[PDB]
A paper describes a structure:
Ubiquitin transfer requires a motion facilitated by a flexible hinge that connects the [name] domain N- and C-lobes. To gain structural insights into the mechanism of selective inhibition, we crystallized the [name] domains of both SMURF1 and [name], without and with a representative SMURF1 inhibitor, compound-8 (Cpd-8), and determined structures at 2.05–2.75 Å resolution.
The structure of [name] in complex with Cpd-8 demonstrated binding of the same cryptic cavity as the SMURF1-inhibitor complex. However, in contrast to SMURF1, inhibitor binding did not elongate the [name] αH10, and the invariant glycine (G628) stems the hinge in both the inhibitor-bound and -unbound forms. The resistance of [name] to inhibition is likely conferred by G630, which, in the presence of compound, does not form the bond network required to lock the elongated αH10.
Numbering used by the authors: 369 to 741
The structure:
Amino acid sequence: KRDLVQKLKILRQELSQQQPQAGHCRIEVSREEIFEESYRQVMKMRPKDLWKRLMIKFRGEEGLDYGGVAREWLYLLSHEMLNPYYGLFQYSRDDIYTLQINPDSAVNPEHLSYFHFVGRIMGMAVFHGHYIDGGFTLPFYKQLLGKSITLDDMELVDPDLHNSLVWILENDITGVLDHTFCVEHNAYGEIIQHELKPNGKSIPVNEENKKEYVRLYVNWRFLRGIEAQFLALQKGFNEVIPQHLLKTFDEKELELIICGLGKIDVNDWKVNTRLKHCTPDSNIVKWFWKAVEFFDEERRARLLQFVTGSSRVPLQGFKALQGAAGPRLFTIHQIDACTNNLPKAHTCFNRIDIPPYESYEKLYEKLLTAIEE
Ligand SMILES: CCOC(=O)c1c(C)[nH]c(C(=O)N(CC)Cc2ccc3c(c2)OCO3)c1C
């Protein structure tokens, strides 16, 4: 933990130097067209403009203070640009929670400029210390942060290919594997023969060159069909965050930064929760924590996402939980409502509204029904 905290202090220090002393990054956009209007304004700016202090205004709105409006625009846009509606990203069919690049994004001919823009925004979130659980896989984040893709990463991407490549590396393939440095794949009904390296079609894979074959294969498979999109996103990102500044961080550290604590702890959660219209020793609070304690990691993540908008636990735990404006502890609010209603969430204030359920079993079932699907 200490090593990571120190690297993050060094990173923040180096990034503050990149920020010009004078000038501002001025953005004026409507909330209703946040994506498109931010796209137009950010893409007219040079990379050096993106490092300047943010001066943001929402169209037709006065705003309380610039710092707060900048925090709100960056949070809202970073989440909005991930919406499948804009044609850049989509949820995996196999893994319903995983966000990935849409391989058919080219239906919008300007798609590359849009991915460049998203990269700039992800860079700007890093620059202003925002930790966003976008939903991408860890190897997606590692590629963006300049880390090499490993054969280990292929396990979940393509399990059969992973076993085959591990087999190539670990065993003598001579006279069993009959392959060359050319891979074939079916893209949109046509078989593409792709050479991993020059003259690939005429180079057989053998004991001497199999390590290079597996490395090139892993790189190609990982970005297959999304090469241009990923390159535009990386280019936008590297215009805000220099690659050299991240070389110090290892894979494990990157995982903790983007996804937060590896487990949702019910003890840390309950001692950092605010109570409204219920007391510490009440039945409703006792039954709520008894349900959360029974909940497994999956159910606790569903509960945290339901109440806060994210299943990411900050590295400092629940005492560091944040809402819309800034710091907002998780809140249990006992409401005066019909006990057949499900619990209601207000993700802005990390708050859950609970009717006065008559028994633990009733609270348990209603909470489970509310966090389903
Ligand atoms: C190595 C040190 O890393 C950092 O300092 C650091 C900070 C401050 N934030 C981030 C981070 O959260 N992401 C990385 C791009 C994820 C992310 C951001 C914006 C997004 C998004 C996902 O989905 C859409 O908008 C990192 C890694």
